[PDB]
Amino acid sequence: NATVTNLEKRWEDLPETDQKDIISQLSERQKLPWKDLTLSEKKAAWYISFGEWGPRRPVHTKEDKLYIFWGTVIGIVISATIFGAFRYNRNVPKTMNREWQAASDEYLKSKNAEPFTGYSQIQS
Amino acid sequence: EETYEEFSQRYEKEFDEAYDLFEVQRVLNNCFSYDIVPSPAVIGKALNACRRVNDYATAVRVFEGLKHKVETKEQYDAYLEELKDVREELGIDLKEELFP
Amino acid sequence: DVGPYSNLPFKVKNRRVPYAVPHFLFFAIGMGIPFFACYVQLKRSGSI
Amino acid sequence: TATEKIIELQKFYQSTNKPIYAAHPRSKYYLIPYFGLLGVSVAATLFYTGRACFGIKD
Amino acid sequence: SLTRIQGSVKRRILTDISVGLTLGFGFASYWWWGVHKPTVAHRENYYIELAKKKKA
Amino acid sequence: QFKTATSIAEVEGLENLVGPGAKTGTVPTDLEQATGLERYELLGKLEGIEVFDETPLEAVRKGTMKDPILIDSYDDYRYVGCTGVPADSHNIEWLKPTTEKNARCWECGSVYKLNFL
Amino acid sequence: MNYINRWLFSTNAKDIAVLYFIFALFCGLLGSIMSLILRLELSAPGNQILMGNHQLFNVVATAHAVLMVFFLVMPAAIGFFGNYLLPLMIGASDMSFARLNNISFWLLPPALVSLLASALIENGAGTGWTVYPPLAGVQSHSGPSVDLAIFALHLTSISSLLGAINFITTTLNMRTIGMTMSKLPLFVWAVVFTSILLLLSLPVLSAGVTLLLLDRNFNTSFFEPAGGGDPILYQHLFWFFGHPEVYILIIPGFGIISHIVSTYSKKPVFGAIGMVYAMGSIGFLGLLVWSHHMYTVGLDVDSRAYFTSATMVIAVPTGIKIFSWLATLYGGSIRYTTPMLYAFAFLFLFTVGGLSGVVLSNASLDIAFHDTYYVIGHFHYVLSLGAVFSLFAGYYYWSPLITGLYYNNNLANIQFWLLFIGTNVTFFPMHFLGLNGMPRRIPDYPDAFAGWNAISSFGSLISIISVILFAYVIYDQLVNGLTNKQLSTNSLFKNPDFIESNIIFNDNSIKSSSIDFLLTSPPLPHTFNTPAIQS
Amino acid sequence: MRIQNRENLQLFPFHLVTNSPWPLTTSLALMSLALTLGLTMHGYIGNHLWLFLAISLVLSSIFLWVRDVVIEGTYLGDHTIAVRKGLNIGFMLFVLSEILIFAALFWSYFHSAMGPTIEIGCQWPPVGITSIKPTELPLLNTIILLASGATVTWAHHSILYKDRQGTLVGLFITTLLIILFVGCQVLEYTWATFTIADSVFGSIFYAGTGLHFIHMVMLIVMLAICYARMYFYHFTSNHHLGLETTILYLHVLDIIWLFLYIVFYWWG
Amino acid sequence: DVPTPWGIFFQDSATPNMEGIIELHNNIMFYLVLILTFVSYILYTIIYNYSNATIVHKYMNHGQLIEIVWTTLPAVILLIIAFPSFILLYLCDEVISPAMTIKAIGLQWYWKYEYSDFINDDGEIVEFESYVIPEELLEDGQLRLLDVDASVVVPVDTHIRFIVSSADVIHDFCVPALGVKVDASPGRLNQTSALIQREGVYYGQCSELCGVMHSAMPIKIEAVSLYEFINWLDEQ
Amino acid sequence: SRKLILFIVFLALLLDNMLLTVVVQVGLLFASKATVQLITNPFIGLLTNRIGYPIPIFAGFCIMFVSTIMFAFSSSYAFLLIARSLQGIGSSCSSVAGMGMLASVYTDDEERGNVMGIALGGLAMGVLVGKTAPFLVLAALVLLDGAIQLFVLQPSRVQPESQKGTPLTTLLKDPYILIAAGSICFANMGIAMLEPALPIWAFLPASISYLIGTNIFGILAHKMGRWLCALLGMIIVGVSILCIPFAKNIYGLIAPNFGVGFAIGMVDSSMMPIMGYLVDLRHVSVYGSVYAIADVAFCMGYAIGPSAGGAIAKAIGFPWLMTIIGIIDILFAPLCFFLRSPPAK
Numbered sequence A: 001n002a003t004v005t006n007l008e009k010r011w012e013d014l015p016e017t018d019q020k021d022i023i024s025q026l027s028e029r030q031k032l033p034w035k036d037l038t039l040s041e042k043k044a045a046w047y048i049s050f051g052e053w054g055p056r057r058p059v060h061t062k063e064d065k066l067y068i069f070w071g072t073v074i075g076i077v078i079s080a081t082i083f084g085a086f087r088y089n090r091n092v093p094k095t096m097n098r099e100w101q102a103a104s105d106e107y108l109k110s111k112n113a114e115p116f117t118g119y120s121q122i123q124s
Numbered sequence B: 001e002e003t004y005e006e007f008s009q010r011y012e013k014e015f016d017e018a019y020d021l022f023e024v025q026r027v028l029n030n031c032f033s034y035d036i037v038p039s040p041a042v043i044g045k046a047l048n049a050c051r052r053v054n055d056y057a058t059a060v061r062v063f064e065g066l067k068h069k070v071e072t073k074e075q076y077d078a079y080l081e082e083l084k085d086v087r088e089e090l091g092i093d094l095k096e097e098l099f100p
Numbered sequence C: 001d002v003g004p005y006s007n008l009p010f011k012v013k014n015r016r017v018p019y020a021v022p023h024f025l026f027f028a029i030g031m032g033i034p035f036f037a038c039y040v041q042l043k044r045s046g047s048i
Numbered sequence D: 001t002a003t004e005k006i007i008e009l010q011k012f013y014q015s016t017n018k019p020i021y022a023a024h025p026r027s028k029y030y031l032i033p034y035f036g037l038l039g040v041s042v043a044a045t046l047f048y049t050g051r052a053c054f055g056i057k058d
Numbered sequence E: 001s002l003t004r005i006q007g008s009v010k011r012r013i014l015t016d017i018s019v020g021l022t023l024g025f026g027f028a029s030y031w032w033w034g035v036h037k038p039t040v041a042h043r044e045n046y047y048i049e050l051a052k053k054k055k056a
Numbered sequence F: 001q002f003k004t005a006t007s008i009a010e011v012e013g014l015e016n017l018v019g020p021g022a023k024t025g026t027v028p029t030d031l032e033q034a035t036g037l038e039r040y041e042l043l044g045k046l047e048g049i050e051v052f053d054e055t056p057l058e059a060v061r062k063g064t065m066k067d068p069i070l071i072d073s074y075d076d077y078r079y080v081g082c083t084g085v086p087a088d089s090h091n092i093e094w095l096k097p098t099t100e101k102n103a104r105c106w107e108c109g110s111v112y113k114l115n116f117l
Numbered sequence G: 001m002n003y004i005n006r007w008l009f010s011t012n013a014k015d016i017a018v019l020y021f022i023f024a025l026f027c028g029l030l031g032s033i034m035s036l037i038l039r040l041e042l043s044a045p046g047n048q049i050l051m052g053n054h055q056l057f058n059v060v061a062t063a064h065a066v067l068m069v070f071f072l073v074m075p076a077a078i079g080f081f082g083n084y085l086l087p088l089m090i091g092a093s094d095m096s097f098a099r100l101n102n103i104s105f106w107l108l109p110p111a112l113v114s115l116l117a118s119a120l121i122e123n124g125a126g127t128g129w130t131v132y133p134p135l136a137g138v139q140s141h142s143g144p145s146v147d148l149a150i151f152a153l154h155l156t157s158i159s160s161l162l163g164a165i166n167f168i169t170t171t172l173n174m175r176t177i178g179m180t181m182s183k184l185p186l187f188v189w190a191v192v193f194t195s196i197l198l199l200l201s202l203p204v205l206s207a208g209v210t211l212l213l214l215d216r217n218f219n220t221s222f223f224e225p226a227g228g229g230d231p232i233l234y235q236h237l238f239w240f241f242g243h244p245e246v247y248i249l250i251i252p253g254f255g256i257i258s259h260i261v262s263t264y265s266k267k268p269v270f271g272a273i274g275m276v277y278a279m280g281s282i283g284f285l286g287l288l289v290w291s292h293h294m295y296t297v298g299l300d301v302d303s304r305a306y307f308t309s310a311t312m313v314i315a316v317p318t319g320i321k322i323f324s325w326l327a328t329l330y331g332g333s334i335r336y337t338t339p340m341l342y343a344f345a346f347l348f349l350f351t352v353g354g355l356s357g358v359v360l361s362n363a364s365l366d367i368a369f370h371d372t373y374y375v376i377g378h379f380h381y382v383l384s385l386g387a388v389f390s391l392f393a394g395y396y397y398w399s400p401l402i403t404g405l406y407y408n409n410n411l412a413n414i415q416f417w418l419l420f421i422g423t424n425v426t427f428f429p430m431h432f433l434g435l436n437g438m439p440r441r442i443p444d445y446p447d448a449f450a451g452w453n454a455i456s457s458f459g460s461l462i463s464i465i466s467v468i469l470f471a472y473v474i475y476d477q478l479v480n481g482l483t484n485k486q487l488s489t490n491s492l493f494k495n496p497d498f499i500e501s502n503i504i505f506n507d508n509s510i511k512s513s514s515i516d517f518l519l520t521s522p523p524l525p526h527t528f529n530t531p532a533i534q535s
Numbered sequence H: 001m002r003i004q005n006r007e008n009l010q011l012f013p014f015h016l017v018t019n020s021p022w023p024l025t026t027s028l029a030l031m032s033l034a035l036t037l038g039l040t041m042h043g044y045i046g047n048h049l050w051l052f053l054a055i056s057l058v059l060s061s062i063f064l065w066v067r068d069v070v071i072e073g074t075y076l077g078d079h080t081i082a083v084r085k086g087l088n089i090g091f092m093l094f095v096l097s098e099i100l101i102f103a104a105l106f107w108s109y110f111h112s113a114m115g116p117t118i119e120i121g122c123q124w125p126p127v128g129i130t131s132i133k134p135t136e137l138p139l140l141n142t143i144i145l146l147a148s149g150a151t152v153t154w155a156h157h158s159i160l161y162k163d164r165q166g167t168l169v170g171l172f173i174t175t176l177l178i179i180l181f182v183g184c185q186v187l188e189y190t191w192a193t194f195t196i197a198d199s200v201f202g203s204i205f206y207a208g209t210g211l212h213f214i215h216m217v218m219l220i221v222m223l224a225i226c227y228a229r230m231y232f233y234h235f236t237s238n239h240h241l242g243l244e245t246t247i248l249y250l251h252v253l254d255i256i257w258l259f260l261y262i263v264f265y266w267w268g
Numbered sequence I: 001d002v003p004t005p006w007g008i009f010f011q012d013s014a015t016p017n018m019e020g021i022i023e024l025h026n027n028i029m030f031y032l033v034l035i036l037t038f039v040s041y042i043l044y045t046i047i048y049n050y051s052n053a054t055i056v057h058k059y060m061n062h063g064q065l066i067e068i069v070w071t072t073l074p075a076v077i078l079l080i081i082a083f084p085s086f087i088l089l090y091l092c093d094e095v096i097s098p099a100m101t102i103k104a105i106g107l108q109w110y111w112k113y114e115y116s117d118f119i120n121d122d123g124e125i126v127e128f129e130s131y132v133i134p135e136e137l138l139e140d141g142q143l144r145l146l147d148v149d150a151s152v153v154v155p156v157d158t159h160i161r162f163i164v165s166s167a168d169v170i171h172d173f174c175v176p177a178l179g180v181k182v183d184a185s186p187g188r189l190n191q192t193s194a195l196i197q198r199e200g201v202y203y204g205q206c207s208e209l210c211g212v213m214h215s216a217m218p219i220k221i222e223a224v225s226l227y228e229f230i231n232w233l234d235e236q
Numbered sequence J: 001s002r003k004l005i006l007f008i009v010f011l012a013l014l015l016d017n018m019l020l021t022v023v024v025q026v027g028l029l030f031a032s033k034a035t036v037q038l039i040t041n042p043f044i045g046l047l048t049n050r051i052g053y054p055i056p057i058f059a060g061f062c063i064m065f066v067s068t069i070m071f072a073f074s075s076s077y078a079f080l081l082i083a084r085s086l087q088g089i090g091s092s093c094s095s096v097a098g099m100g101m102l103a104s105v106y107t108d109d110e111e112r113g114n115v116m117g118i119a120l121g122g123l124a125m126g127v128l129v130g131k132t133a134p135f136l137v138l139a140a141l142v143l144l145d146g147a148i149q150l151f152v153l154q155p156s157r158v159q160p161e162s163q164k165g166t167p168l169t170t171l172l173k174d175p176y177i178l179i180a181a182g183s184i185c186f187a188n189m190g191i192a193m194l195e196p197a198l199p200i201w202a203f204l205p206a207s208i209s210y211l212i213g214t215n216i217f218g219i220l221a222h223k224m225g226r227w228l229c230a231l232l233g234m235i236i237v238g239v240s241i242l243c244i245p246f247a248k249n250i251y252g253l254i255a256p257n258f259g260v261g262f263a264i265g266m267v268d269s270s271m272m273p274i275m276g277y278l279v280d281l282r283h284v285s286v287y288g289s290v291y292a293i294a295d296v297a298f299c300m301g302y303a304i305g306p307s308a309g310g311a312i313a314k315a316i317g318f319p320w321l322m323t324i325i326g327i328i329d330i331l332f333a334p335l336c337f338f339l340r341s342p343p344a345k
């Protein structure tokens, strides 16, 4: 009974010469009429052919999607820290100051421009 | 173009002539690939085809495909109240009575 | 000698210098040429 | 012999053990000047395309 | 009876086209009746107001 | 380089296909000047024997384990494309039968075996 | 000596495709670094990296155009996938003219030298990709820089023409025993339809370039308006090449996508005859429209109406292909492996890239969008997000068969998601900048256009990290690649079915619709000794 | 495939080429030509003897390809019925690309002739530029081209009826009727009153009748290698793929010349 | 008008042609939004129902009714789009009586404006040149790379015909708000028409590439009333 | 507003040739188009003096539109013959009124040949033409542009013509018009009785040579001389049509076909504006009736050819038939030297 019971925890560890003896001993017990098979043989014959081992494994396990997600997060964080360094060290011209973008609004108010949705040149 | 009453004669004829396990699983694989579900007569021939080739897992996996092909649950339980003398004579047990 | 390391022009295993140096220098030159071109043409035209 | 050496040079180009472009005892006169002058022609356009990068004209 | 099922995928296709068009027409009737027409109304009411000031 | 052939029963290689010479002052013909795979084809077409076949695969009978369709090869493998017994039903499925294993065509079920020539 | 007679003096078709791949990676790296140099100059207003020099900005843009239109997409989609796969699909041993394949490769390394030397020996060649005549004279660009850049469009043209004639003459008389020309796979039809346009499109470009060279150096006055010529002539003689060109880059992608939709959704392609007629109609209607690039030059009013009509007609055949791919994906079983995610990311980004061209096809709407960043935001969704994903999907599809070494699935997925996020961040605010009125080819811009230029410069640093991760994926493929077939079931070409047992599946593993995936995976040098047979 | 000793010969009728060094050397010669042509027109070299070496090496490399394609067909003997069909398909798809260069030059003339600009006072062939009269020497060229088109048919019709003296004569007379076309067209370039630069009309006339000149030197070379390969007994009465390609190449150039004579010499 | 900082949509219109362009774009975007939502919903359904599925329908591969529906339905959309495009192409132009002519000659890196009317007996035709105000010489509140030294001053409610040519290379006269974009090739004269309905200032920039200082050559159009135009002509 | 007329005429002749070439006891069905077109064509030349030009064009477009769809449901032989009838009528209306409109709006003789050379290129895409669903959408869009220009933007009355034209009886008595129509007759005599007779004993070379030849000789025939072009083209027709009995292989028939459709494409494009020149020089300037005569002399050949070709093939054989049609093609040509200068008025 030990060769048949609990094959769900040992089938992927046995070599390929002890796997072809369990199949060649359940293929001479299935020729008998059924109702004469034990419950463990019915479970083992199901797990051997239609079971989640070998070519029926999923592509993505649960412990792989976390790996992909956390590979993407530290793929975005590094680019943010590189881009921040090219942002402190900039050539800021004299026009991008708030006191220069508030004087232009008076000129655009006197000469009526954007009477629709809006004019505002302030972006600090 | 094919009708229900020609589908359910052609696949009975094709199930009553298989000789190996490859052929039984070949005919079973392209029977569940149409818009028409198999009749209770065709599935009655498939279990005897699995018996002649002496396989047990295929006779259980036939009943598992009926859960996915059939639209609702009441039709599925209508399939198991006609295919009951076939099951209890051959000895086939479902997956949800084994808990594998 | 047909096999999985037979159709490549370069050797991958059983080598004196490890493969990381020829793999890295390829991408380094490929990413460092158009900075050298910009350096030369910046220095030829007055600016630093 | 006669002008029909075609039934003689067709027994030489097959069973040779040398490549086709160097099988006859005449291909030296074709292959030595060509490969000699190609190594001067290529080495002349790599001396004038590095000299053009440094601004030197003639 | 309950043991005769003949067509299932065709009705799925007919429902899957008759929802993706109503949803698309719903998402296109908001670009033309909530983004477009009030802007035309605002543009016109600006021009029916600028002329009256010049008239007075 | 050796004795010249006359018909394709006396061709044991590329050494028997040089031919005689033409005469001075005439335009030579193709029975007097050809060596390789050109004279072999010419020597086949003057008898009725096609050296290079172009006949497609058999689509009359299906194939079992006891009576399988025999494909001829000069190697241990030959690529076989099945499209059905009415010859256009089965879609194009390719198979590699060998001298140790038989292909079985997952949709229709034809079996192919090697005849190693 | 055996190294020289197999990798320099070559005859085999599969031994040259690897050299196309190695050249393509180098020339795709150079242009990506030049695009990063462009994108850190257009970050905030002012003069930041290039100190004051408006040359070496147009030079960088021209060298970004040429190196990734002419040296990346065509060598990858013609050399690595056309030379390697097409004899294996049609069942031929080698191609018809092998020495022409060798010369078609070897004209490209000395085509790179002329272009890289065309960016050093004066201030440079800042004419743009379209080398317009009266700017490319002797009065603005006076030196051997534009000349050495227009000799790099001749050697590439000769290479493409010699490849196209080989591809047509191979598929006509080098088929197997029972393949008529209605049973060919779709990729062969794609290569054939591009190789006809390469015959019918390259002479007019060669004529235009040679006439420009004669105007520059032998004062012929074809395009000078002081002797009786017009610049507009050159524009015609460019764009008759120009619009077939942008289809030549996209047709070999489509066929690749078809194969992926056939295999990871276990269904045949919905209406393959519809696909081959659609490819034919798309190829034919790319010659009859070339003047929608010139709506502001001063055309007639009865000529605008024809060219608006003949451009919107091309929406009808492409929709057949899109809806056929959806109908192929509809019923089947789908597993999300790493070519299949690129296939799904092509069916949504090409359609948002192609619907903007119906907006740009109208002559009335083009007087608000011409020479404006809406055009750039148009053509990056169909160049960078339509063709490059096709190339990546083809590589991840066919690299275990060609090489025999597998790759890590997780790192490839991280690369795909980084490329998706960064490339969609970069190319979307260009539409907004185009709608607000930002012109093209400007180093400095007004202060209003700053904010989106801060966001579109953030995605480039996301995509270059994806390129570096792709480099590590190739390294992990080559070294210890024999043990990366048991980590995940991505190595399997096809999933076992519902009733197919594992014991039966291990005996009969590969079920295919082509000759490709039944070969041993290093393919043999002489693959077919006895001919292949087809019913 | 059931002949007795069949495995000793090839099982498919196609050619497997030996390894050759010529594709690399043609590319290295074209690199030298491209770089020296890009440099010598702007200084940087001075002497004009490097460009001539580049042109000479390109031509010698092409001739060295041609040597190896001749030996593989008349000596080694690998040209079956399929390979000849492939070479014919190949040659036709190059002649097709050769024609479409001339269509661009024809369209570059009709876009300037029909619709002339302001700067030229609107008149073709314009004021002060006398054209070439078509009732002179450009008739003798047309007559000798239609004579040469008829002389090559007598050369291909005498190799099928097995006459050797009658194939050499036709090819010799044809080669002497193409040298006179070149000689008449070089004496018509030294007795002309308008140059390359003095119009747009003198720009297209010397760019549609200058490419034709280069395409006609190739015919003199091609019929030289068809007379010399026939004197040394390489051509049989049913396997001659050198004559058929040069006959198809002569007739296309004749049809192109009859369109280079109506639109440039007559129409104005 | 001026560009706005975080812009999403078009600038404000001042000409009937730009209003027609806006209306046609908003008409096309209806059908394009419908098609994109249809394709997205089918992709969502395919992902949500048929992912890792046991049953594969490998025999639904022909179609005959459905293949005509995705050939005729995209055609009807093309005709419905094509009707107002042809009407707007043919209708709105200078049908009746243009009233002024302004010649805009495009030199290398600045613009030249002449007013072809207002001629004296000796050829006293009014002319000026528009340059770029540099960053060092800007006053408090002016716009960088858009502000010029002399601006083109036009009346309102008057048809204006722009004749554009060039003397060195190919340029492009572009004022976005007014709906004007025409080229300037060195050997022909191109013409466009504009009508301005409200007063204000309108900025524009060149489009076709010209060389080093392509980015600094703007166009500025002011629309005064008729009395101010008369007072402005008597000073220049 | 002149180029759109050329587009409409090109599309009308394209639909003409596609409906004529695509055919779906076969000689009773096949000869139904050109027989009705032989009769209907003089009537439109008199109708356009009453109703005007654009209304028969677009009415004919409507008639072919709802008659091709009616042909789809048609199964019985009477329904097929009454379906091919009125398809002939709509084709006749579109062709005659479109060529009249191009003759009306293009007054200069030099520009008229250049326009009609491009306009006659539509009678090769019917033989050549694929999917054919995109091209019909393109045709529908160009027809929308034509309707928008002619019926919506500017409204017009019925508008009878300003001058009454000469009747049809006095135009058939003019000798030069008969000589002009005789060339278009006898050039198509050789090409009509070949395609029904070819399966008893090609389309792409003829169509390509036609489309290449007509566009360039429509421009060149003015300064080259029209009668010289007619002589050269008709002699090339005769010499090319005699060479088919000598050829006995299908691969050898490619070279005469480039002989035929090229030279026919010459002799149309030089002889078709010369009738408008004859009408402008000798009579009053009304263009409908002379081009009705042109369409009669053009389309009588497709009616008469396939019916008589089998009878002559059973009578004398193929090389004799090809030789006598070559004799007919060559021997008419020296009459065209009469086209140097007609008597003026």
Ligand code: HEA
Pocket (backbone or CB within 6 Å): G246, G247, G249, G250, G292, G293, G311, G314, G315, G316, G318, G319, G322, G350, G351, G353, G354, G355, G356, G357, G358, G360, G361, G362, G366, G369, G370, G371, G375, G379, G382, G383, I035, I039, I074, I075, I077, I078
């Ligand atoms: C390589 C990719 C590619 C492709 C495939 C195409 C093909 C097309 N291109 Fe081309 N195009 C370029 C890249 C590409 N182009 C480039 C780089 C330029 C030059 C720009 C420059 O030089 O600055 C150019 C030139 C160019 C221009 C000129 C730009 C200008 O105004 O300055 C325009 C617009 O007029 C345009 C639009 C189109 C359209 C509509 C298609 C169509 O073929 C695409 C059609 C796609 C669809 C329509 C999607 C269909 C999906 C559906 C679900 C069907 C629904 C049905 C309906 C829409 C009715 N392209």
Ligand SMILES: [Zn+2]
Pocket (backbone or CB within 6 Å): F082, F083, F084, F090, F093, F105, F107, F108, F109, F110
């Ligand atoms: Zn099968």
